[PDB]
Curated annotation (Swiss-Prot), chain A:
<comment type="subunit">
    <text>Part of the 30S ribosomal subunit. Forms a tight heterodimer with protein bS6, also interacts with protein uS11. Binds to the C-terminus of IF3 and to the central section of Era.</text>
</comment>
<dbReference type="GO" id="GO:0005840">
    <property type="term" value="C:ribosome"/>
</dbReference>
<comment type="function">
    <text>Located on the back of the platform of the 30S subunit where it stabilizes the close packing of several RNA helices of the 16S rRNA. Forms part of the Shine-Dalgarno cleft in the 70S ribosome, where it probably interacts with the Shine-Dalgarno helix.</text>
</comment>
<protein>
    <recommendedName>
        <fullName>Small ribosomal subunit protein bS18</fullName>
    </recommendedName>
</protein>
<comment type="similarity">
    <text>Belongs to the bacterial ribosomal protein bS18 family.</text>
</comment>
<dbReference type="GO" id="GO:0003735">
    <property type="term" value="F:structural constituent of ribosome"/>
</dbReference>
<dbReference type="GO" id="GO:0070181">
    <property type="term" value="F:small ribosomal subunit rRNA binding"/>
</dbReference>
Swiss-Prot record, chain B:
<comment type="similarity">
    <text>Belongs to the universal ribosomal protein uS11 family.</text>
</comment>
<dbReference type="GO" id="GO:0003735">
    <property type="term" value="F:structural constituent of ribosome"/>
</dbReference>
<dbReference type="InterPro" id="IPR036967">
    <property type="entry name" value="Ribosomal_uS11_sf"/>
</dbReference>
<dbReference type="GO" id="GO:0006412">
    <property type="term" value="P:translation"/>
</dbReference>
<dbReference type="InterPro" id="IPR019981">
    <property type="entry name" value="Ribosomal_uS11_bac-type"/>
</dbReference>
<comment type="function">
    <text>Located on the upper part of the platform of the 30S subunit, where it bridges several disparate RNA helices of the 16S rRNA. Forms part of the Shine-Dalgarno cleft in the 70S ribosome, where it interacts both with the Shine-Dalgarno helix and mRNA.</text>
</comment>
<keyword id="KW-0687">Ribonucleoprotein</keyword>
Curated annotation (Swiss-Prot), chain C:
<dbReference type="GO" id="GO:0015935">
    <property type="term" value="C:small ribosomal subunit"/>
</dbReference>
<dbReference type="GO" id="GO:0000049">
    <property type="term" value="F:tRNA binding"/>
</dbReference>
<keyword id="KW-0687">Ribonucleoprotein</keyword>
<keyword id="KW-0694">RNA-binding</keyword>
<dbReference type="Pfam" id="PF00177">
    <property type="entry name" value="Ribosomal_S7"/>
</dbReference>
<dbReference type="InterPro" id="IPR005717">
    <property type="entry name" value="Ribosomal_uS7_bac/org-type"/>
</dbReference>
<keyword id="KW-0820">tRNA-binding</keyword>
Length: 70, 119, 155
RNA sequence: AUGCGCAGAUACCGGGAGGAACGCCGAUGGCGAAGGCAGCCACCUGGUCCACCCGUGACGCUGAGGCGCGAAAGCGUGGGGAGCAAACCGGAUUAGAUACCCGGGUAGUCCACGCCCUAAACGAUGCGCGCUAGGUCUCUGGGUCUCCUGGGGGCCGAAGCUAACGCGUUAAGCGCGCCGCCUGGGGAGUACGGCCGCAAGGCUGAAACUCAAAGGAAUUGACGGGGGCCCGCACAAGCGGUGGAGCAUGUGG
């Protein structure tokens, strides 16, 4: 694959409004991606999961999507 | 009866049966079918073949309303999922695009002893 | 057959039409290793296909067989509970086996008193496609369809 | 099959109510003395780790009793009640089936307040301190950031220990301090007494009588309605038979 960290420069992963970055961390089913895939560290992924959830409650990110072409 | 050129094909594929409902673009039923709706009874209604018959029945019943293409939406994981899908493809009635939208609680109600055996 | 695949035992060409398929059919006619008496019958019966139709016996023969080969049949199977007649494709070598076996059985089911006749009239009724052999053959094929619902078990 | 459906159910779309639980992240992860703790947000609040080497000056350890906390189920009063589900009502199954499977269903599961105080409450391993090779994975600090250096979590395993299995700087090693506990099996966590509890019951806890054992770990077998991989006319595939008749022969009676 590729690692979703390897696609970006400095981003504040506490910034729960940056949908353009934040969104690249969800699956196509819109679920928080595993670290296997995100390429973040434990500490980081802990803060990400927290920020994404916030985005979600705000309406700026999905809780789920339907899988396309199954 | 009304003309509906295209719309939606819902496959509800359970372990015990497969039902197919076909709807207009807004999701109002046009026709339906199932393993019981074909001749089968009880256990056989499961079976990939029942699924086929049912999908085909539902499609042919629906082409009657001049329906010609559909979006597919599958729900469940069950002996007959993909036969129902291949059947709509092979039914004529052009398959625009398949989506799986099986529901899943974001951890919700305690399940029946049957679906809990993993403690 | 635990170890091997077993070679399709290879037969000795027909000393009169030059056909392995024929010997095969002669053997199926044979009782208690009376191969002589058996061939008398097959040939006397080819006699009764001229004496009754314009075309060549080897041709009626080849054809009768063709009609009697089944394409699907039910094989029995273990599942959690009781058993399932599972339809599946019938391999070429077996198709042949079954055809001949059935022709000979169907033949000796007929009413006419002398063997070569029975063999012949059955051969004839088969290429026309209406012998009791082609019957107990559509019975198989039909029955494999009845059970089309269980064709997801074929090994 | 019971059951539900033409008083139109199942499937499908839209709106609403409600209760309970938080998918992915999620880990071999973290936190807490234990029980235990998982959507998100605020506020109130406990513990703890590192660096600086600044203050006090042995103020320490442990801890009978006391007091507090303590999963589930259960109890009381009042709410709540979606889904699940002892009991219970049915349907199957069965030799029977007061069960396993299926359809229903009350207590209960949920909240508040008050009880109960139990457990395979487990690392089945009390608490503190000092000492005794290393390797590798990991969470979380600091540094001069290959690495070095604290504090957690793991595995492998120096020395050593152990009946063995194992343990091994997270000791079951080498030592000190203090607490708790054991003293063959059954009778019995029973009786009695006391204490506690609204009750259920809890804590404490015998005796007569009786047994030659009860036990732990590992060994070789054998066995499994355990797993892998093999074979035989073992099954399948065939072809001809016995079972039926008459008789021959052996046998039971």
């Amino acid at each position: 694959k590729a690692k979703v960290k390897a696609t970006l420069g400095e981003f504040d992963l506490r910034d729960y409004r940056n949908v353009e970055v934040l969104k690249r961390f969800l699956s196509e089913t819109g679920k928080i991606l595993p670290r296997r895939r995100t390429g973040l560290s434990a500490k980081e992924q802990r803060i990400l999961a927290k920020t994404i959830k916030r985005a979600r409650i705000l309406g700026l990110l999905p809780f789920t999507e339907k899988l396309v072409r199954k | 009866k009304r003309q509906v050129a295209s719309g939606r094909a819902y496959i509800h594929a359970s372990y015990n049966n497969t039902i197919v409902t076909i709807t207009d673009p807004d999701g109002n039923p046009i026709t339906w079918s199932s393993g019981g709706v074909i001749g089968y009874k009880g256990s056989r209604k499961g079976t990939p073949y029942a699924a086929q018959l049912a999908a085909l029945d539902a499609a042919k019943k629906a082409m009657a309303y001049g329906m010609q293409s559909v979006d597919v939406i599958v729900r469940g994981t069950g002996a007959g999922r993909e036969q129902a899908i291949r059947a709509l493809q092979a039914s004529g009635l052009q398959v625009k695009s398949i989506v799986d939208d099986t529901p899943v609680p974001h951890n919700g109600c305690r399940p029946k002893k049957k679906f809990r055996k993993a403690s | 057959a635990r170890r091997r695949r077993a070679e399709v035992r290879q037969l000795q060409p027909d000393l009169v039409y030059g056909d392995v398929l024929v010997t095969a059919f002669i053997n199926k006619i044979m009782r208690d290793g009376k191969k002589n008496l058996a061939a008398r019958i097959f040939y006397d019966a080819c006699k009764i296909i001229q004496e009754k139709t314009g075309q060549e016996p080897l041709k009626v023969f080849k054809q009768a067989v063709e009609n009697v080969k089944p394409r699907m049949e039910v094989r029995s199977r273990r599942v959690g509970g009781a058993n399932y007649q599972v339809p599946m494709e019938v391999s070429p070598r077996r198709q042949q086996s079954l055809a001949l076996r059935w022709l000979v059985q169907a033949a000796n089911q007929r009413p006419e008193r002398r063997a070569a006749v029975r063999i012949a009239h059955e051969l004839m009724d088969a290429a026309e496609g209406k012998g009791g052999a082609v019957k107990k053959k559509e019975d198989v094929e039909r029955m494999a369809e009845a059970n089309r619902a269980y064709a997801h078990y074929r090994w």
